[PDB]
């Protein structure tokens, strides 16, 4: 089988700059005629893959000239000139020359934008959940950049770590930001045994950690 190796595995880039992605095969991919059947696909988040370039350098219908392909032997490159936030997604090379047709592992292109602090919101457990013997305190850190960020939980000013779960979204295609949720899970009995729940967000946009919290007293 033909193995397609892609580099880099992740790739940051600013709007307007050029992006370069490499694909290397385990053997030359020429066909019986004299053509190389290497294609590039782009898979935007939530969508299905879509052909950009085929046969090394030919643009597919509707693909701007900003996209170009080249290469020979085992090295192929895809260049994206003047990156627009919409180019965001996972790029994949592919060869149909040999059986079985194979794809590279993909290169994720992320757009670099001006840093942005998050917008933090905390939410108390729902009466509906409390009823079933459980309780979850949720906190949203929305539309921020860069992706890196820390979240600290406090119960009455007493930092809590066990039972916390964080999950990040992919980069938005609109504002090029990230958002993340932090979910502290504890029991009803335990939850009601205290009052001041706090959610602190520490991001590089400030040494001061954005703080939000509530009290079962109101």
């Amino acid at each position: 089988d033909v193995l397609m190796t892609q580099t880099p595995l992740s790739l940051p880039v600013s709007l307007g700059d050029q992006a370069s992605i490499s694909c290397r095969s385990s053997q030359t991919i020429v066909h019986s005629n004299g053509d190389t059947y290497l294609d590039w696909f782009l898979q935007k988040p939530g969508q299905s893959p879509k052909l950009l370039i085929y046969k090394v350098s030919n643009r597919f219908s509707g693909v701007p000239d900003r996209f170009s392909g080249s290469g020979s032997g085992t090295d192929f490159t895809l260049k994206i000139s003047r990156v627009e936030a919409e180019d965001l997604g996972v790029y994949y090379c592919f060869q149909g020359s040999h059986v079985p047709p194979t794809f590279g592992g993909g290169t994720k292109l992320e757009i670099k934008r001006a840093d942005a602090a998050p917008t933090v919101s905390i939410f108390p457990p729902s009466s509906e959940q409390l009823t079933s013997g459980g309780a979850s305190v949720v906190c949203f850190l929305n539309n921020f950049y860069p992706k890196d960020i820390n979240v600290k939980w406090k119960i009455d000013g007493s930092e809590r770590q066990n039972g916390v779960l964080n999950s990040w979204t992919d980069q938005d295609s609109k504002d090029s930001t990230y958002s993340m949720s932090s979910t502290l899970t504890l029991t009803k009995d335990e939850y009601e045994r205290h009052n001041s729940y706090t959610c602190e967000a520490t991001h590089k946009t400030s040494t001061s950690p954005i703080v939000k919290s509530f009290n079962r007293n109101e």
């Binding site: 969508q47 794809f103 108390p124 729902s126 959940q129 949203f140 979204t169 938005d172």
Partner: protein, 216 residues
């Protein structure tokens, strides 16, 4: 309109069977070669099988003898019959059209259909509202303890699509949990209602949860 729509995905146990379908429309189905390409949870793309217009079939060695591809050139439908399913067959299955030009490439793909191979049993989700404790207000829905993926989440039946994002589901204790965030102008809430709709196909579940402000 040239389009492909796949269906039939779901939770199947090891060694079990499952038949997938792909409805073509907008082009002369019978003239084109077709393929099934899957995407593992790792996001890796794998060619599964290809069937030409001539009816000839080529399988990926690892499914040869287990999978059976077929086509109904009358109803314009492509099928993939899977038997002896394994954990590694877990993936998003995509239907794709192959176009020749005298060579070939995949020029059309459908949205895919999810298939999860596992011994674990189905578990519907519990859906809880997320209401705040001053220009915009963020609300949300907590969808937790369900299996398998996926679930769909919309706000106000899909009419409230801006300022919306859903956090990836995270597996923990063999159950997935995720939450959805919706931000709207504060001047329209609680005024104009905000409700999230959550469907979990595997458990035939469909819950609507209205985000009502906490008073007490």
């Amino acid at each position: 309109e040239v389009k492909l729509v796949e269906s039939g995905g779901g939770l199947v146990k090891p060694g079990g069977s499952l038949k997938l379908s792909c409805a073509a429309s907008g082009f002369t189905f019978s003239n084109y070669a077709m393929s099934w390409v899957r995407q593992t949870p790792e996001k890796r793309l794998e060619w599964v099988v290809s069937i030409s217009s001539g009816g000839s079939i080529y399988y990926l060695d690892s499914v040869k003898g287990r999978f059976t591809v077929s086509r109904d050139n009358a109803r314009n439908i492509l099928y993939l019959q899977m038997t002896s399913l394994r954990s590694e067959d877990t993936a998003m299955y995509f239907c794709a059209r192959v176009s020749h030009y005298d060579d070939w490439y995949f020029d059309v793909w459908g949205a895919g259909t999810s298939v999860t191979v596992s011994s674990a049993k189905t578990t519907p989700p519990s859906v809880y509202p997320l209401a705040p404790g001053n220009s915009m207000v963020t609300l949300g829905c907590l969808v937790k303890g369900y299996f398998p993926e996926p679930v769909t989440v919309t706000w106000n039946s899909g009419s409230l699509s801006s300022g919306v994002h859903t956090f990836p589901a995270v597996l923990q204790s063999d159950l997935y949990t995720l939450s959805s965030s919706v931000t709207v102008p504060s001047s329209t809430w609680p005024s104009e209602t905000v409700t999230c709709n959550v469907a979990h196909p595997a458990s035939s579940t469909k819950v609507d949860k209205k985000i009502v402000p906490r008073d007490c």
